[PDB]
Amino acid sequence: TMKVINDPIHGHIELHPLLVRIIDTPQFQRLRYIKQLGGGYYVFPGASHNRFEHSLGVGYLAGCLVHALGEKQPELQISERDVLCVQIAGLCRNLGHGPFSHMFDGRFIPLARPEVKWTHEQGSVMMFEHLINSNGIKPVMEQYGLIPEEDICFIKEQIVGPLELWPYKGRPENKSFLYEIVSNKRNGIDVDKWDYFARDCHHLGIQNNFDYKRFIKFARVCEVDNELRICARDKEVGNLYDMFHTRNSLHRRAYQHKVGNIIDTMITDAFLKADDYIEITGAGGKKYRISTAIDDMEAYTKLTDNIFLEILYSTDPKLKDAREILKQIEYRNLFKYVGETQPTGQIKIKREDYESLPKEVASAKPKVLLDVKLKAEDFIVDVINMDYGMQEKNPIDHVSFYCKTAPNRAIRITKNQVSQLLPEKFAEQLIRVYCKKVDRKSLYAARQYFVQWCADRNFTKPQDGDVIAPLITPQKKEWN
Amino acid sequence: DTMKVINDPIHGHIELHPLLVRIIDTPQFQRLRYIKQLGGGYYVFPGASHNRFEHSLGVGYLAGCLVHALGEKQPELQISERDVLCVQIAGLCRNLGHGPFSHMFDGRFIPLARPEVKWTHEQGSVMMFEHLINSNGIKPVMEQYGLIPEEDICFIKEQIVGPLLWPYKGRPENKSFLYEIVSNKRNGIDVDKWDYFARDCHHLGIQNNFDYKRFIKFARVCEVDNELRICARDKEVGNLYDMFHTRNSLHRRAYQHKVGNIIDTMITDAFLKADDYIEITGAGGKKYRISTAIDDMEAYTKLTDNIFLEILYSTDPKLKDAREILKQIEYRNLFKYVGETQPTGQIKIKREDYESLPKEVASAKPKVLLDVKLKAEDFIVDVINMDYGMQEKNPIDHVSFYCKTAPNRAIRITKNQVSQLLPEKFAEQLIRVYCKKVDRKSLYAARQYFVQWCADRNFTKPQDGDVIAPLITPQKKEWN
Amino acid sequence: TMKVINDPIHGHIELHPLLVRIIDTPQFQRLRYIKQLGGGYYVFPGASHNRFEHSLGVGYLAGCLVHALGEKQPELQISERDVLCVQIAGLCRNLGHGPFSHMFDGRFIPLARPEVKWTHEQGSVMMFEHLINSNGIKPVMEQYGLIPEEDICFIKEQIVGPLESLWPYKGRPENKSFLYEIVSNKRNGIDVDKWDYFARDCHHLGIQNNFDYKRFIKFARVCEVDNELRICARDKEVGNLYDMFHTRNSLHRRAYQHKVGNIIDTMITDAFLKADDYIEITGAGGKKYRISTAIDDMEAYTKLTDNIFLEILYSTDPKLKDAREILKQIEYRNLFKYVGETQPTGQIKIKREDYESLPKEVASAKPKVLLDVKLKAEDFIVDVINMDYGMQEKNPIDHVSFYCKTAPNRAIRITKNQVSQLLPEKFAEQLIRVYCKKVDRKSLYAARQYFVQWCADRNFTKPQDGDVIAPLITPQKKEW
Amino acid sequence: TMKVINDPIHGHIELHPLLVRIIDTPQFQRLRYIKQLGGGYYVFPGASHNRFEHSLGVGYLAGCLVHALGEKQPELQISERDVLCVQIAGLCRNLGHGPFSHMFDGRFIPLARPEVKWTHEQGSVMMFEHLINSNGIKPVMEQYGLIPEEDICFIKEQIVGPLLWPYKGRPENKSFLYEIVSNKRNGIDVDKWDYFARDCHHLGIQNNFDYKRFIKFARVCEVDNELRICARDKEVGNLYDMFHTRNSLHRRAYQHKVGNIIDTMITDAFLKADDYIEITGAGGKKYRISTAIDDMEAYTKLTDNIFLEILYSTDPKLKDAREILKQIEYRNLFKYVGETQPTGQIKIKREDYESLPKEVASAKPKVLLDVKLKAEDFIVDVINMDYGMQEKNPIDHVSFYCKTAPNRAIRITKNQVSQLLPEKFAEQLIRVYCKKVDRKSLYAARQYFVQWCADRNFTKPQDGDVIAPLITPQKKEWN
Ligand SMILES: Cc1cn([C@H]2C[C@H](O)[C@@H](COP(=O)(O)OP(=O)(O)OP(=O)(O)O)O2)c(=O)[nH]c1=O
Ligand SMILES: Cc1cn([C@H]2C[C@H](O)[C@@H](COP(=O)(O)OP(=O)(O)OP(=O)(O)O)O2)c(=O)[nH]c1=O
Ligand SMILES: Cc1cn([C@H]2C[C@H](O)[C@@H](COP(=O)(O)OP(=O)(O)OP(=O)(O)O)O2)c(=O)[nH]c1=O
Ligand SMILES: Cc1cn([C@H]2C[C@H](O)[C@@H](COP(=O)(O)OP(=O)(O)OP(=O)(O)O)O2)c(=O)[nH]c1=O
Ligand SMILES: [Mg+2]
């Protein structure tokens, strides 16, 4: 039988018994202990929500879209088997997230294990495999008409893309539109965003959203270059632009909030300091570190936001340094935000260069009297890539549309056909600088270094530059 | 008289000072209950039943909130209760001048019915305001509550319509910031937008709006070029860009919906056909027409959306033609939307040229076989100016900011200091074409004329151009 | 073909072309000019909504429920024909409402035409026929597979009940009995009409309360009950059903029967009575009707809407001076004054036929207090309001069938004692409001004395403010 | 300066710097790790919210109400000092909650430490004292004009009541201030107002109390020789609705049958872990889950984390505790059998709760059964549902005023309002569950249960005729 669940975003949602079986596992229930926005909760107190409930939402919306396409276009031959596979992929696409979500894969792993190339998407696939095998799900899949060999492959492909011509093995070209629902590699328009827009806004207290219900009603499948793809109605093109504008707004105001990011940074530092001493038991009783738990799904299953509290509540002297950082978070003695700037023209900063940047800021030499002299280790420089999901490219150039007068005929719509008030660029970098020395004099010094460093590098003038560094800003003619 | 509490679905329970209640409980104000905020938009968005009355309450309330907030935070501004009430009254009364179907009346009907005259709802609001005050003995009531009618009436009118050197007489330069609350001529950031974003979204069914409560909390007054102005906190700049983006979204999706506009056009047409025959009694028993009721406020008081029904329910044979158009609206036999295009690059179309455009479309000679030949009178061409409120200018360039480290010091923030993902242009024109002949063949013909016309004029390729006019689009090399 | 409409309560809803044909008629579109809450708009400014949009909502929810039952239980043999008939009945159940909705049938007609018995439900049926016959809808119905003779009967029965046991309906047989429970549930009043108005009225009034109908639809099933197939609710929903009726009563108390909204309805009714001789409405064959006789000709009734209010207000004819003066008093907020509220004690119930005598009784009370002025029957208005759970003294939940998870096909009854001791022991009551047409201070004071004396004389409940408004009277009654 | 914070329920709220100092302490931040609804999150997935954000809301609303009263009635002499003390009490009233909130004081402590009498309210006062002393807050209070000796007493009194006019923190002329945060007279306070709105937002139930309306109509009047908060007469129906809503929310959410069983399972796991888990308190001294309430330094570190510490443990001593939590993750929960209520006169005492599983197991249904069940196979959960004041009507303990005499307080009786109101204001619900989840065990449990209801003259379970068609006929009253 169906289970009904009340979700505050989507209302009462029905879950097929197979989905319930997947949900009621330690691998899935784990998502209850991982905050969707990580350190954002420490800035937006409404953002208490966890990955668990977001995953239900994604699974539900995936089901909505595939059901809608099937109702409208029986000739697509969408089967219940297809519907369940799409729902399962929707449910399980977040399985791979670690403590504090993007902090873990965005900050901690890159620093702890630079050799490795690792993403929550890969984690989701591994967790999914572990979930299936640990809980005897394959037999249950067969009971409901699924074919595990093909369908597990199809599900993994929906999350992570080809495990590698038509590159997919889980389904053929005629069902290509199914791969656009959960995680859309072509243009990023998928049900994951649609849930998190609505859920995050509900919790953050921001009244913004994408109308996904409207979008689903106007979605159709058409042939595009000998593939069946999801097409949007021509009139939806402006709403799609708005969708990405919203996404960017949410990153600016919330996901990349300057303080939420510094808290993530502080937690990451604490995890690095604890990484040698914390042990997580995996398969065979055998022990992993925070940074190696990714190698064993049984261990990774037990790696959640709980680690934060394990460190905070520890008494072991080896963890004193890690614990001290978290204590500073509770007292709100955070690293201090100094300012924000951007690279000018086409200058872009490489990931490998990130390490050198604190050194560059400390090297600056402002022509101002300073009580204190700061060092590289006193500065944090956070570089944030902001885009429309596709680096420099416009995702709407990778969207196919149809018109009311010829619903089967797919078309392209260029930016110029829509509006001159749209963005001319679709990617940029933000640079935030913080100082670990929080006293008045240290902070004043840090401002001088920072603004001097912006000038030296011909970055943009910080918005408060004339107030925080009135002696420095006059030197740069461009600024005034 | 005592203070009144009223439950508004947008703002909750709001308190109204007895003076404001006296102004509200007049025929001149209550009239606004019978004018739809969005006019013909109700005929596309069925939730948009709301009238100008309740919007006016909201504007008055928010005007009060902002001025109170400024006073609390900065006593040195010397904001008085008298100032607060004047600002609230201007907020309440700013919409008094709207006519039937709001912007239809101002924007479409009067320009066509009385081209000699130059008329705006803003001017109407001032005239109505005067009429309201004098007809209802409000001046004595104003003095009772500490207002000085000569100065304060002038101040209120100036807030609505601008000046009738420091050009204002109602308040001096030290109180300049008060003129920025109700109708902000400098940059358009005022409480009117804040109420209509939230109210229209609530009714339309679209999730958006601007967080005005947040904005009020971060608003301050600072000296700018020897004037005291409202300044926003530096960190709010992105939210201000977002405010205008939202405004433009709402215009695109709702206020300029292609069908809501054609319904307004049809109603305008019916009013033109009824203008000779409908009589409205004004001062001294003198009779006016729909188009001349603007000259006498006693008459204009009785001119509301009711005239629509007076025409629809008429039996007089003189009104048969007007009545037939409205009947077509009820049967949904509307003029048919042919398409949309834009001028390319810097071309702009003047208001005086609008008349000639249907002639131009009818003069296009598409190289296609047509059964039927269309005439100028068969075409409607609607030209819509879409901007950020200041024609080609960026309103954020006319905003002053302050930073946390020096709250009294105003600064400027340029677009390059905020984001490269912002618009490079801030005004554009949309051109919609419709046809009054609704049969299949007439419509097909209209499409060919339209696309040919776009090509001839080097306008943008209509989004569905290749589908509606496959023979025409190939000729233009630019289009493909 | 399908139309999509954005409703702020339900989101994007699809309408089948047949329903669109019904909607795009003067008989339907008329509902755009009738306020859902009538005079309530004059108390809650958000309540600008009209019967039109509510009707779309009812039609949509009727569809949702019937679709849900069909998905879950294919063995019911629900056909698309069934679905459309249920939707049409949902759309059309409000067609019979007159100006200001319940004012018209609840106040005006009873007073203008006491000989006649008339209800909006009967109006809806008559309007429905008129709509079908005037617009050639029967052929269109046949085109989509409907059988007009049966189906029109079925639709009318859904609105108004049987047109004259064991099975009293002709439009559908006992096996389809559950379909008659969707639009207007005569058995217990649990239907989609309430579900829409709770959510819509709350959204507009600014009250957060509503009933979770989407939850209810998910738990609804059809079971055999006494050889009929009926809708049954899950046992666990019984408390939510009690809550549904509590919400209904809350809404009546706070809004639909707000003391001032009611007095405004009363004033408008008085104005209509005074205009009834002079206003003419053209019906079939050019024949002329009055406001009170337009109910006899649907062509005339089609043109009878809230517009009449403004026609009276804006009139210059001296015959209409008295009517017009009443409406003018409404605009100035010079209303009949609320004196107080009381209830009958224990057994006592007051009949509609007695309503005329009550003002006489109040005027006959002889308070032992010094009075400057002496009041007459004609100076008093006594409004008696019946508040119940939809079924006079009866508990509607006693007329609900439930099922349990362990035997889903087995219908059961649940008594009040099986649910809670905190529920109501009675399900009907009366409120008595008294108002005075003389608004001066001395007249009002006198009215209060008559009123409280009258309450004491009749052993009604002590008005809440009784000791404040009549400190000399309340001591005489020992109980109080 | 003021901090501004965006709360999804209240919007942008300003926090005075003193309140920020109190918030940015381990004692306060601890509330981030305690779910407001405990096991309810396991039934309503939207209910992720913690006590922390609820406490911000309560503090804000406390400020709103006191500010409103001050604006409207300057003659009350409400000072900024008064405002801050009321806000602090609002912020800090939830400080004393333990893991999974009401589970801890409602289920676990009573079972683990029956000799002790403990409430989260007492915990809040103890935590508050610990917070102040540990973080040097007293000097900061004086900096902003507070007088710690009087004002700390006043704050504690607001949370827990008195430690003649029985209060020492403020005099009788300021008595209305004690009605804002935790209203002992009738329960109408800002704590409910926040949790109604916040819980509804998260649970997905569009129900609520309009507290903004209420605040606008609230006034202080003399009642007896006390200054009290009085509501406008017209708000009486809203106040009845407020308690109806409260009871609705308890029925649908806070006492959800499955949420309660999960709380019961977690409590059981804690009891099994209580001997083995150690929490370091003051002086390096070690405490147990059940004794951490004696030392605030230890209690500071006692949060929902303990659930995961047990779940992730490898120690064999914790196997039994860990197994129970593992069953929760697999959703192998004890099964709900049914619900019943005592009839007429009858009420069940707390001391009798233990015996009830024995009584159910002792019922002898006249039906053929494959399996025989034992006392230990049954859980019987007895829930007292009321309007906050046992049998009493809280509206009888509310004072009102009318628009014609705003300074004259009055009473409004139930009969003056409506005959559709409740005639009783307290009742008991009895839920029975079975630890044996198989088909045959279930079927047996249902027979025992319904027989037991019959034997005890309890109400007929709603599905009684379906689950026990052989049993229900014997009882004439039922049919
Ligand atoms: C009882 C109830 C539950 N809910 C929510 C909580 C859950 O997320 C979801 C399902 O809860 P329930 O409907 O209570 O489902 P259940 O599994 O507890 O009962 P059973 O298996 O006997 O049918 O609905 C409400 O929103 N409102 C309510 O009134
Ligand atoms: C009674 C009531 C009114 N309202 C709304 C309707 C109105 O817009 C607003 C004020 O209505 P009321 O509070 O009814 O005020 P009133 O002027 O009718 O009564 P009095 O003059 O005696 O104080 O509040 C609610 O939102 N909830 C309620 O429970
Ligand atoms: C354009 C648009 C419309 N709406 C609403 C307004 C209407 O109620 C509903 C239908 O609007 P449209 O989708 O614009 O439908 P249409 O009939 O105008 O277009 P076409 O016939 O070419 O398909 O959608 C939105 O909610 N958001 C939007 O962006
Ligand atoms: C930036 C931003 C924050 N918020 C929320 C997040 C926080 O809860 C709250 C405060 O955030 P900020 O206003 O960013 O406060 P801050 O302390 O980071 O900035 P500063 O100290 O420089 O003044 O507002 C929004 O709602 N919208 C926004 O656009
Ligand atoms: Mg009033």
Q: Report phi then psi at D314, rounded to 5.
A: -115, -15
The closest alpha carbon to B109, from B263, B286, B265, belongs to: B265
Using alpha carbons only, give the angle D459, D461, D464 rounded to the nearest 5 degrees. 125
* Helix and strand element counts for chain A (H, E): 19, 11
Q: Is C1 in the pocket of ligand 3 (CB under 6 A)?
A: no
D248 touches chain C (CB under 8 A): yes
- Put simply, the chain A residues between 45 and 104 with a CB less than 8 A from any chain D CB are 45-46, 48-50, 52-53, 56
A401 touches chain B (CB under 8 A): yes
Which residues of chain A have a CB within 8 Å of the CB of B458? none
Nearest CA in chain B to C27: B330
Determine the residue type at C262: N
Contact in structure between A34 and A300 (CB atoms under 8 Å): no
Interface test with C, best of A211, A217, A235 (most C CBs within 10 A): A217
- The rounded distance, in Å, linking the Cα atoms of A22 and A31 is 13
Which residues, in sequence order, are CB contacts of A378 under 8 Å at separation 6+? A358, A362, A435, A436, A437, A442, A446
B421 touches chain D (CB under 8 A): no
Tokens 């911000």 map to which residue?
Answer: D56
Q: Strands D218-223 and D11-15: what pairing? A: unpaired
Which residues of chain B have a CB within 8 Å of the CB of A247? none
Domains belonging to chain D, first-starting first, are: 1-332 (1.10.3210.10), 333-479 (no CATH)
| Burial profile B63-82: b = 16 or more Cβ within 10 angstroms, e = fewer | bbbbbebbbebbeebebeeb
Q: Radius of gyration (Cα) for chain A, nearest Å?
A: 24
Q: At what angle do helices B258-274 and B320-330 cross, to 10 degrees?
A: 160
Q: Is C166 in the pocket of ligand 3 (CB under 6 A)?
A: no
What sign does the dihedral C267-C269-C275-C281 (CA atoms) show?
positive
- Strands of B336-341's sheet in order across: B336-341, B427-435, B379-387
Determine the residue type at B278: I
C198 touches chain D (CB under 8 A): no
| B478 HSE (CA, 13 A, CB side) | 12
In angstroms, the Cα distances linking C418 to A272, C235, D343, D373 are: 59, 11, 10, 26
The overall longest dimension of chain B from CA atoms, in Å, is 76
A374, exposed or middle or buried, with CB in 10 Å at 0-12, 13-18, 19+? buried
Q: Where are the beta strands (DSSP E) in A150-308?
A: 219-224, 227-233, 280-281, 287-288
Set B55, B121, B131, B257: catalytic member:
B121
- The rounded distance, in Å, linking the Cα atoms of D404 and C471 is 12
Partners of A135 in the β-ladder = none
Shortest-distance Cα residue to atom 1 of ligand 4: A253
Partners of D9 in the β-ladder = none
Using alpha carbons only, give the angle C382, C385, C388 rounded to the nearest 5 degrees. 165
Distance B4 CA to ligand 5 centre (A): 7
Set C120, C130, C204, C258: catalytic member:
C120
Contact in structure between B216 and B226 (CB atoms under 8 Å): no
Distance A419 CA to ligand 4 centre (A): 31
Contact in structure between C27 and C55 (CB atoms under 8 Å): no
Establish whether the linkage from the previous residue to C166 is cis, with ω within 30° of 0.
yes
- The rounded distance, in Å, linking the Cα atoms of A479 and A455 is 9
Q: Helices in D207-341 by DSSP H: which ranges?
A: 211-216, 236-249, 257-273, 296-299, 305-311, 319-329
Which residues, in sequence order, are CB contacts of B66 under 8 Å at separation 6+? B181, B191, B216, B219
Name the structure determination technique. X-ray
- The rounded distance, in Å, linking the Cα atoms of D142 and A187 is 59
Contact in structure between B219 and B70 (CB atoms under 8 Å): yes
The overall longest dimension of chain C from CA atoms, in Å, is 77
A87, exposed or middle or buried, with CB in 10 Å at 0-12, 13-18, 19+? buried
Tell me which residues of D are annotated as active site: 120
Q: Is D333 in the pocket of ligand 1 (CB under 6 A)?
A: no
Contact in structure between B243 and B201 (CB atoms under 8 Å): no
A440 touches chain B (CB under 8 A): no
The token duo for D2 is 């003021």
Distance C6 CA to ligand 3 centre (A): 7
- The rounded distance, in Å, linking the Cα atoms of A245 and A242 is 5
- CB contacts < 8 A (B, D): 22
C16: left (phi over 0), alpha (psi -120 to 50) or beta: beta
DSSP conformational letter for B317: G
Contact in structure between D60 and D10 (CB atoms under 8 Å): yes
- Put simply, the chain C residues between 319 and 338 with a CB less than 8 A from any chain B CB are 328, 331-333
Contact in structure between D59 and D94 (CB atoms under 8 Å): no
Q: Is B395 helix (H, G, I), strand (E, B) or coil?
A: helix
Which residues, in sequence order, are CB contacts of D185 under 8 Å at separation 6+? D179, D397
Q: Is D13 helix (H, G, I), strand (E, B) or coil?
A: strand
Contact in structure between B229 and B222 (CB atoms under 8 Å): yes
Within 10 angstroms of residue B14's Cβ, the number of other Cβ atoms is 20
B391 touches chain A (CB under 8 A): no
- The rounded distance, in Å, linking the Cα atoms of B392 and D158 is 59
Nearest chain C CA: its distance from D176 CA (Å): 23
Q: Is D74 helix (H, G, I), strand (E, B) or coil?
A: helix
Which residues, in sequence order, are CB contacts of B283 under 8 Å at separation 6+? B296, B297, B298, B299
Q: Strands B4-8 and D405-410: what pairing? A: unpaired
- The rounded distance, in Å, linking the Cα atoms of A397 and B339 is 22
The token duo for C316 is 């210059």
How far is CA C140 from its chain centroid? 31
Contact in structure between D123 and D282 (CB atoms under 8 Å): no
The closest alpha carbon to B374, from B442, B321, B455, belongs to: B442
Q: Report phi then psi at C233, rounded to 5.
A: -95, 150
Q: Report phi then psi at D219, rounded to 5.
A: -145, 160
- The rounded distance, in Å, linking the Cα atoms of D326 and D307 is 11
Q: Strands D226-232 and D400-402: what pairing? A: parallel
For residue A233, the ligand 3 atom closest to its alpha carbon is 23
Contact in structure between B161 and B90 (CB atoms under 8 Å): no
Within 10 angstroms of residue B173's Cβ, the number of other Cβ atoms is 12
- CB contacts < 8 A (A, B): 106
Q: Radius of gyration (Cα) for chain B, nearest Å?
A: 24
Q: Is C5 in the pocket of ligand 3 (CB under 6 A)?
A: yes
- Nearest beta carbon to residue D420 from set C210, C426, C467: C426
Quickly list DSSP for B195-223: HHHHHHHHHHT------HHHHHHTEEEEE
D236 touches chain C (CB under 8 A): yes
In angstroms, the Cα distances linking C415 to C188, C237, D120 are: 14, 13, 38
- The rounded distance, in Å, linking the Cα atoms of A329 and C310 is 65
Contact in structure between D405 and D450 (CB atoms under 8 Å): no
The closest alpha carbon to D167, from D154, D149, D184, belongs to: D154
Using alpha carbons only, give the angle A199, A203, A205 rounded to the nearest 5 degrees. 115
In angstroms, the Cα distances linking C288 to C123, C285, C291 are: 19, 9, 10
Quickly list DSSP for B320-362: HHHHHHHHHHHTT-PPEEEEEE---TT----GGGGGGHHHHHH
DSSP conformational letter for A462: P
Which residues of chain D have a CB within 8 Å of the CB of A312? 301
Contact in structure between A68 and A107 (CB atoms under 8 Å): no
- Nearest beta carbon to residue A217 from set C12, C214, C218: C12
Q: Is D252 in the pocket of ligand 1 (CB under 6 A)?
A: yes
Tokens 């004491």 map to which residue?
Answer: C456
The closest alpha carbon to B82, from B174, B17, B160, belongs to: B17
Q: At what angle do helices D148-160 and D120-134 cross, to 10 degrees?
A: 160
In this structure, the dihedral spanned by the alpha carbons of residues A254, A257, A259 and A264, taken in order and rounded to 10 degrees, is 80
Q: Strands D400-402 and D405-410: what pairing? A: antiparallel
Q: Is D68 in the pocket of ligand 4 (CB under 6 A)?
A: no
End-to-end CA, chain A: 70
Tokens 């939202």 map to which residue?
Answer: B246
Resolution of the entry in angstroms: 2.5
Quickly list DSSP for B229-294: EEEEEGGGHHHHHHHHHHHHHHIIIIIT-HHHHHHHHHHHHHHHHHTTT--EE-GGG-EE-TTTGG
For residue A238, the ligand 3 atom closest to its alpha carbon is 29
- The rounded distance, in Å, linking the Cα atoms of A470 and A452 is 11
A249 touches chain B (CB under 8 A): yes
D213 touches chain B (CB under 8 A): yes
In angstroms, the Cα distances linking B376 to A355, B324, B359, B442, B472 are: 68, 21, 5, 13, 20
Give the per-residue SS3 of chain C. Answer: CCEEEEECCCEEEEECHHHHHHHCCHHHHHHHHCECCHHHHHCCCCCCCEHHHHHHHHHHHHHHHHHHHHHHCHHHCCCHHHHHHHHHHHHHCCCCCCCCCHHHHHHHHHHHCCCCCCCHHHHHHHHHHHHHHHCCHHHHHHHCCCCHHHHHHHHHHHHHCCCCCCCCCCCCCHHHHHHHHCCCCCCCCCCHHHHHHHHHHHHHHCCCCCCCHHHHHHCEEEEEECCEEEEEEEHHHHHHHHHHHHHHHHHHHHHHCCHHHHHHHHHHHHHHHHHCCCCCEECHHHCEECCCCHHHCHHHHCCCCCHHHHHHHCCCCHHHHHHHHHHHHHHCCCCCEEEEEECCCCCCCCCHHHHHHHHHHHHHCCCCCCCCCCCCHHHEEEEEEEEECCCCCCCHHHHCCEEECCEEEEEECCCHHHCCCCCECCCEEEEEEEEECCCCHHHHHHHHHHHHHHHHHHCCCCCCCHHHHCCCCHHHCCCC
B419 touches chain A (CB under 8 A): yes
Shortest-distance Cα residue to atom 22 of ligand 1: C405
Interface test with D, best of C205, C385, C418 (most D CBs within 10 A): C418
Which residues of chain B have a CB within 8 Å of the CB of D217? 5
Q: Is A44 in the pocket of ligand 4 (CB under 6 A)?
A: yes
- The rounded distance, in Å, linking the Cα atoms of C298 and C283 is 7
Contact in structure between B265 and B108 (CB atoms under 8 Å): yes
- H/E segment holding residue B446: helix B440-457
C13: left (phi over 0), alpha (psi -120 to 50) or beta: beta
Asked if B425 lies within 8 A of A425 by C-beta distance, the reply is no
Contact in structure between A232 and A396 (CB atoms under 8 Å): no
Asked if D460 lies within 8 A of C410 by C-beta distance, the reply is no
A366, exposed or middle or buried, with CB in 10 Å at 0-12, 13-18, 19+? buried
What is the length of chain C? 480
Nearest CA in chain C to B54: C45
- H/E segment holding residue A23: helix A17-23
Contact in structure between B93 and B125 (CB atoms under 8 Å): yes
The token duo for B188 is 């358009």
The closest alpha carbon to B6, from B64, B61, B83, B68, belongs to: B61
Contact in structure between A442 and A435 (CB atoms under 8 Å): yes
- The rounded distance, in Å, linking the Cα atoms of D148 and D133 is 11
Within 10 angstroms of residue D354's Cβ, the number of other Cβ atoms is 11
The overall longest dimension of chain A from CA atoms, in Å, is 77
Contact in structure between D323 and D313 (CB atoms under 8 Å): no
Shortest-distance Cα residue to atom 15 of ligand 1: A4
Tokens 């049938």 map to which residue?
Answer: C105
Q: Is C218 in the pocket of ligand 2 (CB under 6 A)?
A: no
| C92 HSE (CA, 13 A, CB side) | 34
Determine the residue type at D283: G
Nearest chain D CA: its distance from C110 CA (Å): 28
Distance B257 CA to ligand 3 centre (A): 8
Contact in structure between B7 and B58 (CB atoms under 8 Å): no
Q: Is C2 in the pocket of ligand 3 (CB under 6 A)?
A: no
The closest alpha carbon to C309, from C23, C42, C26, C125, belongs to: C42
In angstroms, the Cα distances linking D297 to B270, C31, C250, D279 are: 79, 67, 48, 9
The closest alpha carbon to C179, from C144, C147, C215, C153, belongs to: C153
DSSP conformational letter for B378: G
- H/E segment holding residue D427: strand D426-434
The token duo for B443 is 């419509």
